[PDB]
Design goal:
This is part of a larger assembly, with one copy of chain A (148 residues), two copies of chain B (231 residues) and one copy of chain D (204 residues). By secondary structure, chain A is an all-beta fold. Chain A has one helix and seven strands; from the N terminus they run ββαβββββ. In chain A, strands 1, 4, 6 and 7 form a four-stranded antiparallel beta sheet that branches. A three-stranded antiparallel beta sheet of chain A has the order 3-2-5, with no helix packed on it. Chain B has a single domain, classed as Jelly Rolls. Chain B has a five-stranded mixed beta sheet, with no helix packed on it. A four-stranded antiparallel beta sheet of chain B has the order 5-11-8-9, with no helix packed on it. In chain B, a hairpin with a 2-residue loop joins strand 1 and strand 2. Classes of the chains: A mainly beta (148), B mainly beta (231), D mainly beta (204).
Chain lengths: 148, 231, 231, 204
Amino acid sequence: GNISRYYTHWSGSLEMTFMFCGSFMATGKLILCYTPPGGSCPTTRETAMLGTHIVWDFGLQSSVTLIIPWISGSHYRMFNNDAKSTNANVGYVTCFMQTNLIVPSESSDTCSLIGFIAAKDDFSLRLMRDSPDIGQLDHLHAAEAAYQ
Amino acid sequence: LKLGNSAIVTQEAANYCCAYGEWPNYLPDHEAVAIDKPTQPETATDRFYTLKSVKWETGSTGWWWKLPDALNNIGMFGQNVQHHYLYRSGFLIHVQCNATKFHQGALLVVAIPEHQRGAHNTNTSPGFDDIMKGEEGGTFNHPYVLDDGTSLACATIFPHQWINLRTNNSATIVLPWMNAAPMDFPLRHNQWTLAIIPVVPLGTRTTSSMVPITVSIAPMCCEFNGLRHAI
Amino acid sequence: LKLGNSAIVTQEAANYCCAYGEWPNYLPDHEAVAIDKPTQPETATDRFYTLKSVKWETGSTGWWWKLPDALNNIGMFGQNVQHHYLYRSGFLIHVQCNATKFHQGALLVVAIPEHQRGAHNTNTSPGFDDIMKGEEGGTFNHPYVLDDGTSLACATIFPHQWINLRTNNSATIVLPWMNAAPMDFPLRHNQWTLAIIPVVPLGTRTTSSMVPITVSIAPMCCEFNGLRHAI
Amino acid sequence: AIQTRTVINQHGVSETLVENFLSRAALVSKRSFEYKKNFFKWTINTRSFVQLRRKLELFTYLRFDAEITILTTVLPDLTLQAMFVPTGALTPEKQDSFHWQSGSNASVFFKISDPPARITIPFMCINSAYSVFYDGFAGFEKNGLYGINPADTIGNLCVRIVNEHQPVGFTVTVRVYMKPKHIKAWAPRPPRTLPYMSIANANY
């Protein structure tokens, strides 16, 4: 999300990764459901299962691998004025609670999740531009050194 | 188990214990009935339709389901029950729970074919709502006699595995097509009856240990009647 | 034409005049976009979706349709427009009328790609309801200029056949994929524009000779995006 | 408010190479002065514009060449000089200083009716690569400017009106452009998102 700001058109496949960091005694199942770019986001647990869904627990593996098939994108300056046409909504990566958390009577009753992301080798870029990530200017302390 | 659309990952492999000896086998050498060009979709059914998570307290007494009944409502297999009337399918059952090392207890996954139910202390046959429960399933009122007068002590004649909370937390049973006729009707007949029965109740220092139990069902090799024809 | 589920029988064979030279060809050698495993159903689309019968009186002035628009509502192809957003398909058009030997008149089946419409004597672009008609189709208000300022006298540059009521009563035109991008969106783009135009009006001893005209449409080799995936 | 898509077929990989990732020749300095301090002196530091500063600080060590092009906008026959002065030699401080008459440093001479001048400068860093971020101290005693490498210097150019004091007065506008060539980078580093506050260091 910081390299692709320099460009305009992007296309490729991605790879998300999760890493659960609970205690060794803790168990529990979760669910990850994918959404195609056509419809809307799911709401309940039952309506999310009808898409591409996986069932992932804690006791066997603390890691999991998810493959995003395809993305795209552009900016589409099509009006007469300085307008910003937002790109269309694509995909949802949701997570619901299959079973409630099981902890022993010793450890804390709170766990954590961390989500990773990595692009594949089909990700291609084009039409390098500038990035609005910083801003125009701020007040510099020692603006001129060379001149004086 | 990377099957079709879904993949229940991070499971002990255990054993794909076949029920008696067999496989769904796609039903060959039958042309004297159902000549309607069976469509037999395969890659549009294999999803691992999961069920509602249940809670197993101390004084719990088990649950039961019906396999052609519980899948009438969900998914592509749920739609294909309507606008069709003949089918044949084999099943896959994955039962999995979870607990700590400090709990203790025993469960018994068992599957009965043609499990005719009954009512306690009456002379009236059970109603239509007393059978067609759907996804959620029902509850045994007398688990020692299986609500038919047959003893649970002899109930290991059926295919079964022992989920023992000291050793393991999973089980997997494959069911073939068990029916007199080759093809059948969904809305008025249920071949298998999946049921779980606690034998030893749990125990810990506190109370109300939930031990959530999850059952996942997947049809192996289904087929249907004909829907598209030339003339 | 025994194609899939339906079969429009008892037609003069005429000519399967290809539009320019080609066939739908199933789109090979494309892996830099739409890597989503296209499903490409073939035997679940070929039905010959027929349309509403129209009436061609003496003072009639023709009709027009849009091909990705008119099939959004009917059938398995009507369902597959929803829960999908990329597709590619080739079409088949069968236009057939009927009359006695005592009538006389001439019709002109023509198909235009990217037929941008327009309005008469204003400066406002046409609304969304002035385009998305659906199954029933619209009506030319100025047939001599095709509602864009282009002359009908030069309109034989497109693929066309001449239904002449003295000679024949049928026509058949095959359309390939005519688009800049390989795959497209159904709900905001219409590639072809099917339209019929009377050139010589009818005539008989009485009035109000109906001459019912029937158009049948069938997608040849369609495909879609992906819907089922492993992980 | 319009949300559209387009399928995109691509096969180009050599577009994202580092050699043509940085060959764009952005502007680096814009300053005007007058003549009636009557010249222009500028150190060849690179972190003057945030469009180029953030774009440059993705890496740790790199090596390239200058390709300096001076564009001049401002008259009877104005002749200008751009005397490059590297390290070791002294910088001029007055218009008629004898450092202008020194031959030991490079110099150009060009008019205004001509197309603007163009030179290029090779790799003059005494290490094997430029040090973008310097994690140490230039000097032994405690007050050293944390983050200035003595190998980071390049030089400074000086722009001077050649002509005599004329009875007309005028104002000269000078722009500089710099095009890196033969790019070799090492050890990529994550970009800075919080805004800069000074040019001497990283503060926020």
